[PDB]
């Protein structure tokens, strides 16, 4: 049973093979995978769940949905027991999104006759979003090698950054981060990153900027004073628009916090392209794991 838990477990060859399938699926490739999948979205994320679900259904995979965990929290029941129940019910795939960090995972994954697809585990990994962001950048520029890719925002809590940065690094891109200094890990050097204090300097350096969703929670946690000050310091404002080359944004946009309400759909925006590329990348992941 093959699984996809972390971008750190992918080899170059594997990324090449996934992105090749993704491009074929984008170009109209059809395939039938005769399998069932449970979409276990303990943490709900409609956009991601619909994307995995529609990817699976277009491949002929029967999909079953557990959402909210359906009132989360079965007391006394582990994540392992839930997965083991899925195995007993005969599911081929489990696509899971959970609010905790699934670590360690190697030995648990090995003990299960399931193809596990991590759709986001806390603050740890979101491999398909990493791949989608990589694919989108690659579709635009041809190659990612030597590109200067800036992530802006809450790096510390970002499973999307942790999934994309290592993929981009593996293929020769240069990563930068910019955000509230309270939200940049002290050893962010593990990702081999340039650090900008000032988002304007970051924007001038970048070929492409990836605004990460700012969660309102960060204000109450004292990482930022307010959302509107965060927008002024770090967001894509109308003044910054003239300078930005190209930009992306993974989750749903927090308008006038991450990105100006007028700037979501522009000729410099690849935001809608990432939405479009999610299904073909997730079809490629199902296919990749069907061995």
């Amino acid at each position: 049973m093959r699984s996809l838990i972390s971008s750190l477990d992918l080899t170059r060859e594997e990324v090449e093979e996934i992105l090749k399938y993704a491009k074929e699926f984008k170009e109209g490739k059809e395939e039938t995978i005769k399998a069932s999948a449970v979409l276990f979205f303990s943490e709900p994320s409609t956009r991601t769940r619909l994307s995995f679900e529609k990817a699976a259904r277009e491949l002929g995979i029967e999909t079953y949905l557990v959402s909210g965990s359906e009132s989360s929290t079965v007391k006394g029941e582990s994540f392992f027991d839930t997965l083991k129940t899925f195995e007993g019910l005969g599911f081929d795939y489990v696509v899971f999104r959970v609010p905790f960090v699934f670590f360690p995972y190697k030995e648990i994954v090995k003990s299960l006759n399931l193809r596990l697809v991590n759709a986001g585990d806390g603050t740890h990994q979101h491999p398909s979003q990493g791949l989608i962001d990589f694919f989108t950048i690659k579709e635009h520029f041809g190659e990612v090698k030597d590109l200067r890719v800036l992530y802006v925002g809450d790096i510390k809590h970002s499973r999307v950054f942790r999934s994309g940065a290592p993929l981009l690094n593996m293929f020769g891109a240069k990563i930068g981060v910019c955000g509230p200094k309270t939200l940049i890990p002290r050893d962010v050097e593990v990702f081999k990153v340039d650090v900008f204090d000032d988002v304007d300097k970051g924007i001038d350096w970048a070929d492409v900027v990836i605004w990460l969703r700012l969660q309102k929670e960060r204000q109450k946690e004292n990482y930022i004073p307010s959302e509107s000050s965060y927008f002024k310091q770090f967001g894509l404002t109308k003044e910054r628009f003239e300078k930005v080359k190209l930009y992306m944004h993974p989750g749903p946009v927090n308008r006038n916090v991450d990105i100006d309400h007028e700037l979501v759909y522009t000729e410099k925006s690849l935001i809608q392209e990432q939405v479009k590329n999610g299904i073909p990348v997730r079809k490629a992941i199902y296919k990749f794991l069907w061995t």
Binding site: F100, V101, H124, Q125, K156, R186, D187, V188, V190
Partner: protein, 422 residues
């Protein structure tokens, strides 16, 4: 037997500056004579030819989980691990359930430990009632019943006036405060704030949480004249601050967990939840700082922080209980400082015996004539493994589970009575 002789062994009593190949005569539980080639007809004999003889080890930091969590460990299983690892005196922590904050809990522990009869168990009381941090505990009733120190371990005291008050009252009673230094505003995550937390996104515990509280404690000990004992130093800055206050004559002591000497935060990548501990395993630079701290005398003693948790409390790092077991594993852990020529054997022994004895103000850790016959006998070169065959704890939570260890206890003698044999 009225009379016992430890024959043929190499004796090291650092408190007395005594080393060489002597025999020891024990009578009525006390050290009678130390002399070259001793014999008395039909006095009992222990043959220590080829072995090190020293004072019984003292561990000033043990969780016995008794009362209230005795599925993890209890006084009996705890006292078994203790003697199997050379310890004739241990000091139990008060974070039991019910906590050690009244004399009924103290007396339960004293009487139970007396029944088990292997190992002196010395309780500590809490700093605050229930360890809730709001009201100072009854130091006086607690000290009078037998507590040897006060700690809110494994919680920090967040209110500085509370810590100041506890130091005043404890010093008035002639006993130390043992502090778990980790500011709860800066240390509420699971592992070190370093490369592993950045890489994996696990919540972190800042080194400054520890340093801030160490600095606070040294200032309060200087101003109150109290004795504070820092429980588990894990960074270089921590050791620089402790030494700053020692050099001023402040009564501040500290201990090191042998696990912070062996392991960095990367052990989280190799042992998962078995590397989860408070304060966390830090970086390579901190590990080497600690070793230098042991070498240059800033760190006063080894103390295991023997902290048993079951296997189900050690799965996903995010949800794991913090703690590592270490009573049975302390000696061979310390012994690779010796093998690497970092500390002498005498120095190793000091840190297990007279150093911790002076911290808790007890007349032990010594082979002085007239003192109790608490004697440990070991082989610095004998190999073994902590696994299911050799583990005496009800738990297994250590990065050393299944590793080859070198150095082992052959005998533990408590009050002239053999209590452990290899």
């Amino acid at each position: 037997m009225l009379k016992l002789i430890v024959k043929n062994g190499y004796v090291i009593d650092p408190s007395q500056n005594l080393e060489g190949e002597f025999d020891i005569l024990v009578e009525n539980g006390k050290i009678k004579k130390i002399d070259k080639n001793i014999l008395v007809p039909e006095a009992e004999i222990i043959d220590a030819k080829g072995l090190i003889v020293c004072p019984g080890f003292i561990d000033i930091h043990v969780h016995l989980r008794d009362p209230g969590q005795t599925y993890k460990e209890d006084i009996e299983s705890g006292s078994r691990c203790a003697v199997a690892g050379g310890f004739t005196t241990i000091v139990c922590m008060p974070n039991t359930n019910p906590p050690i904050d009244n004399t009924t809990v103290v007396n339960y522990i004293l009487q139970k430990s007396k029944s088990v009869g292997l190992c002196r168990v010395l309780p500590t009381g809490t700093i605050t009632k229930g360890r809730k941090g709001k009201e100072i505990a009854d130091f006086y009733s607690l000290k009078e019943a037998g507590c040897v120190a006060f700690t809110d371990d494994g919680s920090p005291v967040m209110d500085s006036s509370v810590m100041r008050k506890a130091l005043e009252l404890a010093s008035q009673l002639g006993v130390p405060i043992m502090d778990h230094c980790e500011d709860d505003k800066l240390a509420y995550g699971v592992i070190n704030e370093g490369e592993v937390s950045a890489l994996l996104g696990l919540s972190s515990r800042a080194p400054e949480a520890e340093e801030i509280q160490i600095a606070r404690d040294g200032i309060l000990a200087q101003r109150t004249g109290g004795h504070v004992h820092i429980q588990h130093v894990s960074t270089k800055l921590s050791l620089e601050i402790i030494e700053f206050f020692k050099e001023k004559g402040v009564k501040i002591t500290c201990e090191v967990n042998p696990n912070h000497l062996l392991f960095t935060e990367r052990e989280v990548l190799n042992s998962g939840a078995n590397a989860r501990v408070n304060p966390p395993l830090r970086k390579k630079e901190d590990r080497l700082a600690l070793i230098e701290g042991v070498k240059r005398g800033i760190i006063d003693c080894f103390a295991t922080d023997h902290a048993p948790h079951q296997t189900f409390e050690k799965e996903l790092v995010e949800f794991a209980m913090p703690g590592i077991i270490g009573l049975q594993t302390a000696l061979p852990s310390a012994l690779e400082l010796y093998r690497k020529g970092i500390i002498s054997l005498k120095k190793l022994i000091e840190m297990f015996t007279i150093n911790p004895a002076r911290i808790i103000g007890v007349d032990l850790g010594t082979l002085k004539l007239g003192s109790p016959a608490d004697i440990t006998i070991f082989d610095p070169n004998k190999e073994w493994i902590l696994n299911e065959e050799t583990n005496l704890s009800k738990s297994r939570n250590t990065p050393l589970w299944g590793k080859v260890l070198k150095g082992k206890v052959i005998y533990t003698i408590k009050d002239g009575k053999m209590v452990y044999k290899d």
